[PDB]
Amino acid sequence: EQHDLFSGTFWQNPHPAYAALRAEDPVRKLALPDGPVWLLTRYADVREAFVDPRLSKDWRHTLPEDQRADMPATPTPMMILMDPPDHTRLRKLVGRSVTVRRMNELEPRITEIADGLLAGLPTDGPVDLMREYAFQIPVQVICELLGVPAEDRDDFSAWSSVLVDDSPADDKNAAMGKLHGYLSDLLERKRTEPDDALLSSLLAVSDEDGDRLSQEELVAMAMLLLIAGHETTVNLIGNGVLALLTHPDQRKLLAEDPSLISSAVEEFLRFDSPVSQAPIRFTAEDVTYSGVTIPAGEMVMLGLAAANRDADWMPEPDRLDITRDASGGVFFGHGIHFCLGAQLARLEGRVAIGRLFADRPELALAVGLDELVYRESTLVRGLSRMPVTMGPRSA
């Protein structure tokens, strides 16, 4: 029987729609508002697709060859929108800065941010755990990462939380512009007053040939990190928290053994992937997956949330099991575009989710599951609000 796709019942719980697709319709054209897209839902296909060089990040493949004689490769100089060789250079340059130790140095501050939020939350409801906890953490973390001055945090938080869908892309189009101007100004200041944070680190990146990020490249990279790192992490927190609130057995296991948190975070990423579909790829030529040919010039979405529950990859994929091993999940992508922030996202997930459940052992949903309202956003598995009762702080 025909499950709604990206409409009606899908938004509250897409997983049965995904399971029916994997089984009976694994390469499926679906009509979306701005354009039709092809959806690949099987694990092996999604994984193959991520390394398929015929699947490009360049939108100009939607144009006939003689009509590309006008258009730029990219709307903004953003690495995620590029193929090699241009991607390879930008990835190389940002990877000089985004280091293992840099990500870890942030851990005490992530803990601080999370503890401060938890302390200001009331015991008796209702509280929206999204607006009040989940929404707040990742941008304050990005602020720490980048070296946004403390005076500017609240302002920067205001402007970026606009990007996380509230009103139409008119004042968001202007929020982008203000963020762009602000960061461009900041990069200026960092050049003469260097510090230990990411923006000044990126400015000085100078490879073996003298190559470096241009002023425009720097600003687009900064904006990318913000956009890639905010909403995604927010929904990791929300979805991971929900997973524990809806599985008392798994929450018990975490409570008894807090060190399971790292394993739990991988399992929440698998079980209810916050980036539900990868950003759109474009067919540079015809491709065939599961006997279905997608013609050249089409838009293709890799179903990460579907692939992560594919029984041909993970046995008992509909069971939540925090002791399980993550190995092979596609929630952070695969191949050349693999999430640049995956270590930080994982760190923020474990801190945010682990400290929450430590501080509030009696945390509970304040509505039924059938009353939860999900964002209607193609690429996102994200709660718009999560009503909860926090309960007493642990002694």
Ligand code: HEM
């Ligand atoms: C739970 C949170 C996160 C999830 C689920 C996630 C997921 C992903 C996925 C699936 C991709 C691949 C896109 C593609 O192949 O088309 C990606 C790329 C990226 N992510 Fe994340 N991400 C998260 C957090 C972050 C954070 C915190 C940052 C930065 C601090 C970040 C920065 C990026 C960047 C820069 C790319 C582009 C990589 C490239 O094009 O070479 N992400 N992410």
